[PDB]
Amino acid sequence: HWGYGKHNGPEHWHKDFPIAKGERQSPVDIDTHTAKYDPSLKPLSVSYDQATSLRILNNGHAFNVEFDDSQDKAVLKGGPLDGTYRLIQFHFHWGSLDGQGSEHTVDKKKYAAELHLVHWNTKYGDFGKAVQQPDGLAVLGIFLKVGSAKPGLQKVVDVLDSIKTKGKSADFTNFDPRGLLPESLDYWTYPGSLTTPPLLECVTWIVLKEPISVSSEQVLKFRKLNFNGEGEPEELMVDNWRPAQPLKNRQIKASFK
Ligand SMILES: [Zn+2]
């Protein structure tokens, strides 16, 4: 029964998930002045042309857009990564107000939301095995700011009414995740964790420098989702973000000067 409330939020997670206080937890603040440019980091290779979206699910903490990950259809490679990482799902974290919502921060700045495109290392055969490995996952993190609408997001926004409450799913085929990517793929990278329980320390984080813009109407629709199931007391799905964790013995690397 973890969540984001006063009684079960991030500050409580360590009681069930002691790794919450571990050595490579996420998110973190990205101090831009202290990140080191690593000229040997390769451009990212985002290969989403053959992506097969399947479904959208309200899981009680976010909504996941799920993909067919039984073949190499939508993959991430390059950058800091060795090998091939398959897209399994994406989801967002967002706030109750435009001035908060992101998990990572940049020089302590919070964005309105943050997109996580979750990928697993094919050498481990499935997602459940991958999360047990220190190089099991690669998560592409993209900040959202409120301004102009993002046309490539609208198909997501419009289905949200069909998955208002926990446990609801809807068919969500033919969605192209390339419509959520900013122009630049410049990034920061560091080793970290899942930002929700079980908080496993299996993620190579790749956080893009350039945010995408979404409209006030689009983010407002995120905030009309519910944490609860249908016929349970309505609790708006807002502020589903974990705050920055200690960096500890990690260095954040930048792909760009
Ligand atoms: Zn996430």
Curated annotation (Swiss-Prot):
Substituting T195 to D/E results in: Strongly reduced activity, but enhanced zinc affinity
| Phenotypic consequence of V118 to K/R | Strongly reduced CO(2) hydrase and p-nitrophenyl acetate esterase activities
- Keywords linked to the UniProt accession: Acetylation, Cell membrane, Cytoplasm, Disease variant, Lyase, Membrane, Metal-binding, Osteopetrosis, Phosphoprotein, Zinc
Cite the effect that the entry attributes to L194 to E/H/R: Strongly reduced CO(2) hydrase activity
In the record, the effect of A62S is given as:
2-fold decrease in enzyme efficiency, as determined by kcat/KM ratio, and efficiently inhibited by chlorzolamide
What changing T195 to A/C/H/P does, per the record, is: Strongly reduced activity
Q: Where in the cell is it found?
A: Cytoplasm; Cell membrane
Other noteworthy facts? Target of drugs used in treatments against glaucoma disorder and breast cancer.
Spell out the PANTHER family in the cross-references.
Answer: CARBONIC ANHYDRASE, CARBONIC ANHYDRASE 2
User: What name appears for this protein in its UniProt entry?
Assistant: Carbonic anhydrase 2
Q: Which organism is it from?
A: Homo sapiens (Human)
